[PDB]
Amino acid sequence: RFTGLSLKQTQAIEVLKHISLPVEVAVTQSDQASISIEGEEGHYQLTYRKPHQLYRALSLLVTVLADKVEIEEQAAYEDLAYMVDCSRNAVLNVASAKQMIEILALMGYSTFELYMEDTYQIEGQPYFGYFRGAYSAEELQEIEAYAQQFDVTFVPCIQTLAHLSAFVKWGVKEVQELRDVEDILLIGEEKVYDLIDGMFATLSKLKTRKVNIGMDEAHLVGLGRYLILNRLLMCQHLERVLDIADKYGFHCQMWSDMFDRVTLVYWDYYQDSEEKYNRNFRNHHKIDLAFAGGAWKWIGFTPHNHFSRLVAIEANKACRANQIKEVIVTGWGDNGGETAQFSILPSLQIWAELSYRNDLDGLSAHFKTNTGLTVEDFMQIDLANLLPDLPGNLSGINPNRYVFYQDILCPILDQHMTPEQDKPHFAQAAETLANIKEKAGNYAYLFETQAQLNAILSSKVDVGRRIRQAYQADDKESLQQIARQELPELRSQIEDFHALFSHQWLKENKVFGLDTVDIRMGGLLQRIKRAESRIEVYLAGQLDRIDELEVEILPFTDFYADKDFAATTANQWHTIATASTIYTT
Amino acid sequence: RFTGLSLKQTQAIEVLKHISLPVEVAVTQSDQASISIEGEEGHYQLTYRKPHQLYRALSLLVTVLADKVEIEEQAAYEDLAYMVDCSRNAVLNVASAKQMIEILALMGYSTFELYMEDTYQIEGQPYFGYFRGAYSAEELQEIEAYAQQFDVTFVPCIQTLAHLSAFVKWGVKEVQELRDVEDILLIGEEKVYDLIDGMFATLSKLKTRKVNIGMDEAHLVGLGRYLILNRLLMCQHLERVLDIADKYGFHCQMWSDMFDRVTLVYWDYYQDSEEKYNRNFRNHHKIDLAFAGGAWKWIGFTPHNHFSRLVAIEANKACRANQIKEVIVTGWGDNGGETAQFSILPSLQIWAELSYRNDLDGLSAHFKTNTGLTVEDFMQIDLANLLPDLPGNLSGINPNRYVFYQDILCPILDQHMTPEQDKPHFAQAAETLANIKEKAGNYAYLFETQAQLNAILSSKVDVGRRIRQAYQADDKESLQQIARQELPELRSQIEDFHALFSHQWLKENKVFGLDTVDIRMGGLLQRIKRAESRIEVYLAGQLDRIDELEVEILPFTDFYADKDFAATTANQWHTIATASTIYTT
Ligand SMILES: CC(=O)N[C@H]1/C(=N/OC(=O)Nc2ccccc2)O[C@H](CO)[C@H](O)[C@@H]1O
Ligand SMILES: CC(=O)N[C@H]1/C(=N/OC(=O)Nc2ccccc2)O[C@H](CO)[C@H](O)[C@@H]1O
Known part of the structure; x- marks a missing residue:
């Protein structure tokens, strides 16, 4: 039972019911403060400097009320x-x-x-x-x-x-x-x-x-x-x-x-x-x-x-x-x-x-009323980027992406991985994210996507290196295993991720531009297949050396070389996926 | 039984036996002509200005001899x-x-x-x-x-x-x-x-x-x-x-x-x-x-x-x-x-x-002795480019490539196809090329690849258009057909082509750089799949419009717009495959 509301504002509060509105509210445009709620005993006065501010006041109103409430904001x-x-x-x-x-x-x-x-x-x-x-x-x-x-x-x-x-x-x-x-x-x-x-x-x-x-x-x-x-x-x-x-x-x-x-x-x-x-x-x-x-x-x-x-x-x-x-x-x-x-x-x-x-001070409080979840939970969405040896003040460190699109045979970012520290982060992050997914409501699609990603990343973060180890040590058990069981599995997981990405994409955006993602993922799956096929050929006697593996891996970039973590920044798909030319004539 | 040959030249002729050597040859470095063969009755004098020219003389020798032979070249x-x-x-x-x-x-x-x-x-x-x-x-x-x-x-x-x-x-x-x-x-x-x-x-x-x-x-x-x-x-x-x-x-x-x-x-x-x-x-x-x-x-x-x-x-x-x-x-x-x-x-x-x-004058003659096939046959390798309405004097017209990498849902080169004239060219070219493959010997791999390509192209040249036709005319028979039978088939053919390309590649080149091709082909297969999946969704009632198809296709380029054929030149994979950004930040 509000008061002093216009037509437009009454419809707005209606569309906005993100929120659960519990009360009598006297609503006045005042230059008193950006937002004033003052009152008690189920009768309140809310004022605003700017009309749009009705809507944050409302959220604060509904957050503070969980009777005496006295709030000013400038x-x-x-x-x-x-x-x-x-x-x-x-x-x-x-x-x-x-x-x-x-x-x-x-x-x-x-x-x-x-x-x-x-x-x-x-x-x-x-x-x-x-x-x-x-x-x-x-x-x-x-x-x-x-x-x-x-x-x-x-x-x-x-x-x-x-x-x-x-x-x-x-x-x-x-x-x-x-x-x-x-x-x-x-x-x-x-x-x-x-x-x-x-x-x-x-x-x-x-x-x-x-x-x-x-x-x-x-x-x-x-x-x-x-x-x-x-x-x-x-x-x-x-x-x-x-x-x-x-x-x-x-x-x-x-x-x-x-x-x-x-x-x-x-x-x-x-x-x-x-x-x-x-x-x-x-x-x-x-x-x-x-x-x-x-x-x-x-x-x-x-x-x-x-x-x-x-x-x-x-x-x-x-x-x-x-x-x-x-x-x-x-x-x-x-x-x-x-x-x-x-x-x-x-x-x-x-x-x-x-x-x-x-x-x-009221971040999580307001966030939960607006989203239906705590801000600590929601922010677990970042996990695939949060490697535990990184300081939180250096920007653009993005393994989420360069671990995913890296080649298997030619893993040019392999110097930037720390699998003993990386593999467990990704695994448990997938676990945490599946948890949150289940309480995330309409936002669950966001976390479903990050959980599959983190799962893929625990495995993928060092398959390329283990291929290289299992090959310089001539171990026909491991190479056969990676090739017949783990790479085909990775492809399966990656297909699943693709599906979840596509759904996330179509929910939020128009169909156009998704094609670039189909292409990049198609390509990755096809490079995984090459890794399976090249190994098999080496395994059937039909190949002398696997040449790709004979190449010493250098650092991908020196942008953060002088720091105490191995990870870095790499945000161009095409230089992530291959050291060959793909765009140039 | 040669004469006047050095050690090096005798080993060279040996490695060069491409050729079938049938004779007595007097071999002299003369400034007489670039190449002189003169003789008869199984005894000849071959001379050369430059030592390397021994080897073309030899080929001419062995071509002309199929007894009186008198050849000068400057x-x-x-x-x-x-x-x-x-x-x-x-x-x-x-x-x-x-x-x-x-x-x-x-x-x-x-x-x-x-x-x-x-x-x-x-x-x-x-x-x-x-x-x-x-x-x-x-x-x-x-x-x-x-x-x-x-x-x-x-x-x-x-x-x-x-x-x-x-x-x-x-x-x-x-x-x-x-x-x-x-x-x-x-x-x-x-x-x-x-x-x-x-x-x-x-x-x-x-x-x-x-x-x-x-x-x-x-x-x-x-x-x-x-x-x-x-x-x-x-x-x-x-x-x-x-x-x-x-x-x-x-x-x-x-x-x-x-x-x-x-x-x-x-x-x-x-x-x-x-x-x-x-x-x-x-x-x-x-x-x-x-x-x-x-x-x-x-x-x-x-x-x-x-x-x-x-x-x-x-x-x-x-x-x-x-x-x-x-x-x-x-x-x-x-x-x-x-x-x-x-x-x-x-x-x-x-x-x-x-x-x-x-x-x-002696092109095919010399070519066949060097390659083991006629120059008309070998030159059928170009077929996927030789559309019958093109004049032979305009360069870089390359449907071989832009018909292959074009998207299905978003076929941005569709204005440059003439399927009634294009579809039959590609089909029969696949036929011609399978023929030649069988006589091409060690070069057969070259023609095997072009035959599969031409096959793919007969079909692919207008699937994108027929999708668009079958959709504006609401024909649930055709769209279901394309989606459940023809697109999956195209993918199969494309996998086959990939295999043949890969073999051709590895025969001629080192493994490095093939990865770019895997990626591009992986991506195409994945866009084909999207076309199958998007149609199915439209077919199961779950979609209003297929938006991609609602887009009017413009010409890809005006480089040859003023000419009497529809085809053109388009030699950048990334602008062939998608109108989205793929390389830019
Ligand atoms: C010395 C030289 O040949 N450099 C490039 C050349 N570059 O050719 C042109 O730039 N042609 C051109 C472009 C626009 C208008 C007229 C001619 O063409 C080749 C085939 O495409 C290449 O790509 C070469 O690496
Ligand atoms: C106005 C503006 O933001 N333009 C671009 C911006 N561009 O940011 C930089 O160029 N940063 C930068 C690059 C090199 C050294 C230091 C800073 O970054 C964004 C995130 O990356 C974008 O891509 C924007 O389209």
């Missing part, structure tokens, strides 16, 4: 947002954007963002998003309106310069004419500014007038086809993009890195101290700033919520000591979008709590 | 060479370099060349050729000495600037420090000139003092890490490379394209007229020249000897009208080295005949 940040990568093969389907929106609402996010390089349609640009599951402006309007039900703002993150590799690869004149080098558009070229105009044109059919135009990471701007036909140049390009946006009413932000009518966004997912962020905040202001932090979900199949917690704590302290008014939580999907979309919910609760309380 | 070219790509995953094993050498000897080639970007070892450079099957200097010395048995010169084609993608991808300091951008080395950097010195050092342990230093196609020379730290520049880089080579005694040639102590090599595999080559010869001389033509074997699984014949005829006329003294026949292996090493023997005989006679 957020640090005027805007908190979550940005989903829909450009790395995984395009979040509508039904999942909605569930996502509902959950961000309950946490306290004001803004929802989709990063689409080429995954939104443009009229008369039919190779822009071709077979990519590009969003229709319907889908973008439907999604935006759903967020609007909760007073949540939609900001498109797009690209107007570089990161356009999947559009520009198409070899028709009308595309090729737009290029300069690699993934970067031809600045100054008129065709380009007509494409960009179609972009904002398509964006203009939504209600938001806030956009992120991208412009990160274009090392080679004007060094290919530009240099050929005709740096400064960026500003020329930028003012133009701005003139275009200002034509359709848009306010623009862009990623800072290549560096008054645009906010710059200093993005940093990596620093383990206040100091480090503080220094770069100095350097940034020195050119209107937002901060993008990281919900680590771009390192293979498995997230890193633990590492996201650590860096979020110190970036929050830096954000506030530099009175940064806007923070963006980024969920990138580097190299295939293979990590689950809902993998990083703890990272999202963490940032909200840090904004609304400057601490993680 | 070659156009001082040096004729064949260059094998050993840098695109396929590294020709020793036993196959030898068979190759013996065959080049019989044709008239003076020079044998291996293109190794990173596929020769260098002391203290253990990531240079790591798991690539890099040649040992033993293997290079063994190979060279084998050629020397026939008076054949070995020239290494290497790289000293760009095309080094498989070395530079390794993320250790000692490698990364050598880079500028993409596949191009850091010019001016001292570490680089120490690497290059190790290259010539390793090359210096062979007898040849002739090298091709590469330096083709470096669009971005000094535009990445160069521009960052410090064009002209090329010459600086070049003189340095030359100073290094001149230290170890080497005479240098290099590919012309980026443009007195170096021969330039104008390379052109494409022009269908004397005129076109003539114009570019003008432009070249205008800066000491050799010509590189093409034995087309870099377009997937299947060569194009027919197209190699056509262009070789007109490039021979241009070569002679510009008194070009050296011609190089290049066998590149773009994007996987998936075409057989011995696929292009007709192209090699063709160039030899053009050099030694300025015509193809």
Whole structure:
């Protein structure tokens, strides 16, 4: 029995019943605090500064009530947002954007963002998003309106310069004419500014007038086809993009890195101290700033919520000591979008709590009411990354992925495994994750996938090495065993994982982009088979040496060579899977 | 019963008995003609200008004798060479370099060349050729000495600037420090000139003092890490490379394209007229020249000897009208080295005949004595490329490859198929190729592979389209048929092809690089399976639309859109197999 609620808010609370609502609530828009709940004896007054904040208050309300309740919150940040990568093969389907929106609402996010390089349609640009599951402006309007039900703002993150590799690869004149080098558009070229105009044109059919135009990471701007036909140049390009946006009413932000009518966004997912962020905040202001932090979900199949917690704590302290008014939580999907979309919910609760309380005092409490599980449990999703000899402050260490896609015969990451410490971690993690799966409810699909992965990894982490040992020691028992029993088994487990991945994928994303995963997994299964077949041939007398095994394994990279753990970072499938050429001509 | 033969030559003729030697031969080194055989009644005089020419004379001898024989030949070219790509995953094993050498000897080639970007070892450079099957200097010395048995010169084609993608991808300091951008080395950097010195050092342990230093196609020379730290520049880089080579005694040639102590090599595999080559010869001389033509074997699984014949005829006329003294026949292996090493023997005989006679009057005759089959038969190896509506003068049209690796659900090359004309070509070609296989002898493996391919292609060329037809017309008979009978069958055929490819591969090359093919084929089989599974789900009521099929297929490229055939050129596996990202981050 609420009071002072509008139509829209009453429907919102309805859709939001994630929550179990137990009470009389006087609801008033007050500048008193971000969120005030005050009351007792089953009658409460809840107020909010911003309308969207009704929904976190509600969650806190329902968490605190487990009668006298007195809660104030003054957020640090005027805007908190979550940005989903829909450009790395995984395009979040509508039904999942909605569930996502509902959950961000309950946490306290004001803004929802989709990063689409080429995954939104443009009229008369039919190779822009071709077979990519590009969003229709319907889908973008439907999604935006759903967020609007909760007073949540939609900001498109797009690209107007570089990161356009999947559009520009198409070899028709009308595309090729737009290029300069690699993934970067031809600045100054008129065709380009007509494409960009179609972009904002398509964006203009939504209600938001806030956009992120991208412009990160274009090392080679004007060094290919530009240099050929005709740096400064960026500003020329930028003012133009701005003139275009200002034509359709848009306010623009862009990623800072290549560096008054645009906010710059200093993005940093990596620093383990206040100091480090503080220094770069100095350097940034020195050119209107937002901060993008990281919900680590771009390192293979498995997230890193633990590492996201650590860096979020110190970036929050830096954000506030530099009175940064806007923070963006980024969920990138580097190299295939293979990590689950809902993998990083703890990272999202963490940032909200840090904004609304400057601490993680009520994290698990709020998280459980929003998800139906404790934040310690959910965060076990990271297990395949959490090797026990790693310090929690070094980023991107991702065995989840490079243990999985490594070849058997030619195991080029074998120097980065520590099987005595690794094999048991993975096994028991599979055990822990099966447990959690059973209480995870609608999220169970997430943990089912990680449990099978961890199972595969306990075995796979050193089959390649044991093959090498069993072969230099001439042991026909072991090689025959690996070849006739263990490798075929691995393939079976891997088929199972594929099935679970596919289900996870289709639940969260559109069908498009899954094909890359089918290909990569198909290939792995086929390399496993070669290992079985090559051994059998060596076993039937028909082969002198197994040459692949005669190769001494070097370190894969020296990125973390000077550290006291063997593991490392390796996030390109193609250099994981083979030392041969696969992409080059 | 020969006469005037040395030890070395007597052993050579022995190894060369490819040939059946039937006679008394007076053998003399004369400047009379390239090759003179004159005689009758079972007693002949054979002379040669160059010692290696003994071996083509012998073949001609044994061809003409099928008694009065009177043959003179004055070659156009001082040096004729064949260059094998050993840098695109396929590294020709020793036993196959030898068979190759013996065959080049019989044709008239003076020079044998291996293109190794990173596929020769260098002391203290253990990531240079790591798991690539890099040649040992033993293997290079063994190979060279084998050629020397026939008076054949070995020239290494290497790289000293760009095309080094498989070395530079390794993320250790000692490698990364050598880079500028993409596949191009850091010019001016001292570490680089120490690497290059190790290259010539390793090359210096062979007898040849002739090298091709590469330096083709470096669009971005000094535009990445160069521009960052410090064009002209090329010459600086070049003189340095030359100073290094001149230290170890080497005479240098290099590919012309980026443009007195170096021969330039104008390379052109494409022009269908004397005129076109003539114009570019003008432009070249205008800066000491050799010509590189093409034995087309870099377009997937299947060569194009027919197209190699056509262009070789007109490039021979241009070569002679510009008194070009050296011609190089290049066998590149773009994007996987998936075409057989011995696929292009007709192209090699063709160039030899053009050099030694300025015509193809004795081509089939000489070819059959060297191979044991007619040149028309052997050249049926090209069938999977020879669509009947294509004109023989447009290059790189390669359905052999893009019909094979295309997806089923998302068949992005479907606009380039003409099944009514394509399906029957492939079927009967499989028939023709099974025939030839049976008479091909030791070469049968080559045709066995093309017959299975053509079989797969008759079916595969339009399954994707028929899926789309059977689905927009709601026909549950056809979709169930394709899904439960035809797709599983395709997979079976594809497994068979894989087996035959693997055997072909291992016969000709080292095991390394086959892994890329396993991966690509594994992936295709897995996409076929998805097509079966997605249909079944649509068939069991559990799916609304099959979304993949709801996508209108556009042309893949407009490269040949203005022509009267539907087919095209598409030679990158990764853009063939999927419109998603697979390589990008
Ligand atoms: C604005 C932005 O975030 N752009 C890319 C970003 N790019 O991040 C870096 O380049 N980091 C980095 C690389 C080398 C040294 C130090 C930091 O990282 C994400 C996760 O990997 C992505 O892939 C984004 O698409
Ligand atoms: C010296 C040389 O031959 N270098 C590359 C060459 N590169 O050839 C071109 O770049 N042709 C070309 C490309 C665009 C327009 C016109 C000609 O072709 C071969 C076959 O494809 C290769 O891949 C070689 O490694």
